[PDB]
Design a protein around this ligand. Sequence first.
Ligand SMILES: [Cl-]
Length: 39
Amino acid sequence: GSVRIPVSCRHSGQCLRPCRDAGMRFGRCMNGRCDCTPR
Ligand SMILES: [Cl-]
């Protein structure tokens, strides 16, 4: 998604919890950082 959070990753699975804990959804890893979809 299009919110970029300052959390590092190499796989989208690693972004599931960071995005949830940020109040957002559908964590994905893009260019080694997590992206989230706003509620
Ligand atoms: Cl989610």
